[PDB]
Design an enzyme around this catalytic site. Structure first.
Site, PDB file in Angstrom:
ATOM      1  N   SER A  36      -5.311  -1.166  67.743  1.00  0.00           N
ATOM      2  CA  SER A  36      -4.229  -0.420  67.721  1.00  0.00           C
ATOM      3  C   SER A  36      -4.158   1.176  68.110  1.00  0.00           C
ATOM      4  CB  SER A  36      -3.930  -0.133  66.133  1.00  0.00           C
ATOM      5  OG  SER A  36      -5.094   0.487  65.521  1.00  0.00           O
ATOM      6  N   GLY A  38      -5.850   1.914  70.851  1.00  0.00           N
ATOM      7  CA  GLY A  38      -5.956   1.847  72.396  1.00  0.00           C
ATOM      8  C   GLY A  38      -7.010   0.958  72.885  1.00  0.00           C
ATOM      9  N   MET A 107     -23.535   1.797  75.350  1.00  0.00           N
ATOM     10  CA  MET A 107     -22.822   0.676  75.520  1.00  0.00           C
ATOM     11  C   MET A 107     -24.119  -0.368  74.680  1.00  0.00           C
ATOM     12  SD  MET A 107     -21.486  -1.098  78.656  1.00  0.00           S
ATOM     13  CE  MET A 107     -21.345  -2.889  78.822  1.00  0.00           C
ATOM     14  N   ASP A 154     -14.450   0.491  56.843  1.00  0.00           N
ATOM     15  CA  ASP A 154     -14.121  -0.680  57.600  1.00  0.00           C
ATOM     16  C   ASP A 154     -15.304  -1.236  57.996  1.00  0.00           C
ATOM     17  OD1 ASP A 154     -12.248  -2.836  58.248  1.00  0.00           O
ATOM     18  OD2 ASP A 154     -11.510  -1.746  59.953  1.00  0.00           O
TER      19      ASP A 154
HETATM   20  C1  LIG Z   1     -20.012  -5.420  76.252  1.00  0.00           C
HETATM   21  O1  LIG Z   1     -19.390  -4.856  75.297  1.00  0.00           O
HETATM   22  C2  LIG Z   1     -18.888  -5.062  73.971  1.00  0.00           C
HETATM   23  C3  LIG Z   1     -18.374  -6.688  73.845  1.00  0.00           C
HETATM   24  C4  LIG Z   1     -17.982  -7.091  72.537  1.00  0.00           C
HETATM   25  N1  LIG Z   1     -17.597  -8.280  72.511  1.00  0.00           N
HETATM   26  C5  LIG Z   1     -18.452  -9.472  72.942  1.00  0.00           C
HETATM   27  C6  LIG Z   1     -17.548 -10.211  73.868  1.00  0.00           C
HETATM   28  N2  LIG Z   1     -16.369 -10.897  73.180  1.00  0.00           N
HETATM   29  C7  LIG Z   1     -16.613 -12.384  72.449  1.00  0.00           C
HETATM   30  C8  LIG Z   1     -16.077 -10.004  71.712  1.00  0.00           C
HETATM   31  C9  LIG Z   1     -16.129  -8.505  71.836  1.00  0.00           C
HETATM   32  C10 LIG Z   1     -18.292  -6.364  71.356  1.00  0.00           C
HETATM   33  C11 LIG Z   1     -18.836  -4.972  71.558  1.00  0.00           C
HETATM   34  C12 LIG Z   1     -19.190  -4.504  73.059  1.00  0.00           C
HETATM   35  N3  LIG Z   1     -19.664  -3.307  73.251  1.00  0.00           N
HETATM   36  C13 LIG Z   1     -19.254  -2.113  72.683  1.00  0.00           C
HETATM   37  N4  LIG Z   1     -20.055  -1.176  72.627  1.00  0.00           N
HETATM   38  C14 LIG Z   1     -19.771   0.056  72.030  1.00  0.00           C
HETATM   39  N5  LIG Z   1     -20.357   1.035  71.951  1.00  0.00           N
HETATM   40  C15 LIG Z   1     -18.488  -0.102  71.421  1.00  0.00           C
HETATM   41  C16 LIG Z   1     -17.855   0.891  70.754  1.00  0.00           C
HETATM   42  O2  LIG Z   1     -18.398   2.042  70.720  1.00  0.00           O
HETATM   43  C17 LIG Z   1     -16.649   0.573  69.910  1.00  0.00           C
HETATM   44  C18 LIG Z   1     -15.507   1.337  70.265  1.00  0.00           C
HETATM   45  C19 LIG Z   1     -14.255   1.162  69.384  1.00  0.00           C
HETATM   46  C20 LIG Z   1     -14.227   0.289  68.502  1.00  0.00           C
HETATM   47  C21 LIG Z   1     -15.384  -0.565  68.280  1.00  0.00           C
HETATM   48  C22 LIG Z   1     -16.596  -0.446  69.082  1.00  0.00           C
HETATM   49  S1  LIG Z   1     -17.867  -1.645  71.923  1.00  0.00           S
END
Ligand SMILES: COc1cc(N2CCN(C)CC2)ccc1Nc1nc(N)c(C(=O)c2ccccc2)s1
EC number: 2.7.11.23
Length: 342
Positions: A36, A38, A107, A154
């Site tokens: 929501s 972005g 990441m 949350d």
């Molecule tokens: C490779 O990047 C990601 C992929 C996923 N997923 C795995 C692939 N999909 C099956 C579902 C989502 C879940 C998380 C991440 N990596 C993320 N790393 C960070 N640091 C994230 C955030 O900082 C973040 C930002 C906004 C909302 C929630 C997390 S999200």
């Protein structure tokens, strides 16, 4: 016709193109998620020579203003954690790009829902669940630091990210629904599955709602299924009562939304309104976890560190996290001293 000189869409979201260079620094790979607020994207930071998640906030006042509150708390958390050792995703930096506020995080690779999906919703072990629990209790202790006093608001499996596969470590993400302890301004809060009884009842609340969320999450991480998978608030309350019984009367007499789920008989006791459900408190946590029956669905029979003794410690802890009274529900420091963590 066109939005933000062509850079935006209907919803004020930045249209992400694959392999675009912003600011001679960030190299955009792929979209990793939508929300929501972005978008979130996977980028390569050329200066630091590393991958990052970039949170692109929508080009819309309300979303900008919300994310500015998020920035304020993340930088308050950086002031109190320079070593990066409390299992929180940390803000690296923020910037404006083509009228979007962008927040840069380290990441991580997967969320805890991904982990669950990879088990086909059968769960991970108790030894893995222990480690994750200690780390989450550490994260909450840090949030409960008196100058921070931060409620995440949350906690669910997608807001818990896995560090990396041989490191066996988790981190808490997304403080955009977060605020500091205060006078009650908000009432429809937390994810329904992990929403606390004080919240369902319309009562005052504090950092203990996050511990309720953590009780639920840890049972789910070992079972693979959500503990309380309500279809709506009535059904959520009913599922909570099935396990934990009717809430105490001293609570229900105070509760402004008591009559949404319960009713007050002539004798002055409270009982369930009829809407399918087991009777109050007969779905014991003892049996959901399978303390004596070889773990969830028998799958932990014979496995080391899955004895009756071990399971009772885990149960005991979870039960302290699912106390109905937010005053007596276990706090982060006392959770860390629990025998489950010896
Ligand atoms: C490779 O990047 C990601 C992929 C996923 N997923 C795995 C692939 N999909 C099956 C579902 C989502 C879940 C998380 C991440 N990596 C993320 N790393 C960070 N640091 C994230 C955030 O900082 C973040 C930002 C906004 C909302 C929630 C997390 S999200």
């Amino acid at each position: 016709k066109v939005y933000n000189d062509g850079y935006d869409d209907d919803n004020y979201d930045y249209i992400v193109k694959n392999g675009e260079k912003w600011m001679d620094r960030y190299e955009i790979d792929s979209l990793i998620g939508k929300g929501s607020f972005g978008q979130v994207v996977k980028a390569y930071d050329r200066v630091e020579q590393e991958w990052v998640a970039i949170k692109i906030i929508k080009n819309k006042k309300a979303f900008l203003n919300q994310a500015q509150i998020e920035v304020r708390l993340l930088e308050l958390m950086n002031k109190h954690d320079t070593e990066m050792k409390y299992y929180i995703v940390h803000l690296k930096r923020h910037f404006m790009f083509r009228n979007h506020l962008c927040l840069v995080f380290e990441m991580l690779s997967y969320n805890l829902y991904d982990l669950l999906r990879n088990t086909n919703f059968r769960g991970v072990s108790l030894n893995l669940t222990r480690k994750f629990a200690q780390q989450m209790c550490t994260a909450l202790l840090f949030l409960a630091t008196p100058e921070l006093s931060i409620i995440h608001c949350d906690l669910k499996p997608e807001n818990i990210l896995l560090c990396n596969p041989k490191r066996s470590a988790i981190k808490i993400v997304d403080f955009g629904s977060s605020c500091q302890l205060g006078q009650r301004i908000y009432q429809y809060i937390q994810s329904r599955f992990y929403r606390s009884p004080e919240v369902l009842l319309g009562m005052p609340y504090d950092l203990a709602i996050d511990m309720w969320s953590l009780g639920c999450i840890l049972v789910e991480m070992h079972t693979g299924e959500p503990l309380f998978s309500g279809a709506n608030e009535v059904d959520q309350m009913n599922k909570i009562v099935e396990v934990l019984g009717i809430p105490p009367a001293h609570i229900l007499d105070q509760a402004p939304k008591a009559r949404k789920f319960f009713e007050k008989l002539p004798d002055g006791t409270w009982n369930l309104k009829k809407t399918e459900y087991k009777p109050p408190g007969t779905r014991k946590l003892h049996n959901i976890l399978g303390v004596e029956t070889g773990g969830p669905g028998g799958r932990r029979a014979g496995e080391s560190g899955h004895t009756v003794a071990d399971y009772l410690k885990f149960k005991d802890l979870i039960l302290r996290m699912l106390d109905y009274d937010p005053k007596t529900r276990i706090q982060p420091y006392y959770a860390l001293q629990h025998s489950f963590f010896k």
